[PDB]
Amino acid sequence: MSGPRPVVLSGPSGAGKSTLLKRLLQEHSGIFGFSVSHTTRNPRPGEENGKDYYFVTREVMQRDIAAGDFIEHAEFSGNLYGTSKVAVQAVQAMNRICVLDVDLQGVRNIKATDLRPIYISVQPPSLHVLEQRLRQRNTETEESLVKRLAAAQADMESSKEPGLFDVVIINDSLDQAYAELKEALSEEIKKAQ
Numbered sequence: 001m002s003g004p005r006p007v008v009l010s011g012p013s014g015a016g017k018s019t020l021l022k023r024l025l026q027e028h029s030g031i032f033g034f035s036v037s038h039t040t041r042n043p044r045p046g047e048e049n050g051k052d053y054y055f056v057t058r059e060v061m062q063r064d065i066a067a068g069d070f071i072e073h074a075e076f077s078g079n080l081y082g083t084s085k086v087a088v089q090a091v092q093a094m095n096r097i098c099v100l101d102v103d104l105q106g107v108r109n110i111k112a113t114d115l116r117p118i119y120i121s122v123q124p125p126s127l128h129v130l131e132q133r134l135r136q137r138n139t140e141t142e143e144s145l146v147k148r149l150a151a152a153q154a155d156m157e158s159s160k161e162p163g164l165f166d167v168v169i170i171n172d173s174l175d176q177a178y179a180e181l182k183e184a185l186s187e188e189i190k191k192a193q
């Protein structure tokens with residue numbers, strides 16, 4: 001619909017997509033806006049309601065799902081996540097480029113919509129490096145960690161699927177990965193300016 005072409009980032013959680021989006025929204029806040037997803041998982045230290053996520057209960061999400069409030073939703077490692085219609089509309093109303101981060105299920109969901117995004121996957125240099133990065137903040141139970149590593153492996157395997165992602169970025173250095181994110185969006189950034 002109306003507004004510039006949206007941007008969908010995916011890849012394993014913890015491998016860089018969220019940090020890179022945060023950096024992009026700091027540097028180019030006049031050009032981009034972030035879609036604030038709903039989730040039923042608990043907040044981590046430093047996360048902010050209405051900025052990182054809308055943190056709601058399952059009961060509340062289910063009411064909103066039943067009302068048709070969501071573009072897409074997914075179950076991931078025991079919790080529910082989703083992109084509300086209003087989250088994307090808020091950015092489009094600002095005439096900004098909407099940026100989203102979602103899992104592989106979300107990528108497939110959005111492929112079936114009319115949003116016509118560019119799709120960028122952000123990969124860790126290895127599963128081993130991802131696991132080390134995750135165990136630093138150590139926000140997950142062991143059961144969740146197991147589900148998350150399984151999902152990360154599936155994600156990496158699918159990143160090379162023909163036609164799925166427009167660009168696949170390997171995040172060995174955040175400065176380098178961030179340059180490559182802007183590279184993929186350079187025409188859109190120039191036009192917005």
Ligand SMILES: Nc1nc2c(ncn2[C@@H]2O[C@H](COP(=O)(O)O)[C@@H](O)[C@H]2O)c(=O)[nH]1
Pocket residue numbers: 011012013014037038041072073074076081082083101102103104105106107
């Ligand atoms: N499909 C979908 N996935 C989401 C959404 N919001 C977050 N996720 C994904 O859920 C996974 C877990 O996120 P985390 O719990 O680590 O913040 C990540 O891949 C993240 O991008 C959403 O609105 N829809």
Ligand SMILES: [K+]
Pocket residue numbers: 035036037100101102
């Ligand atoms: K999100």
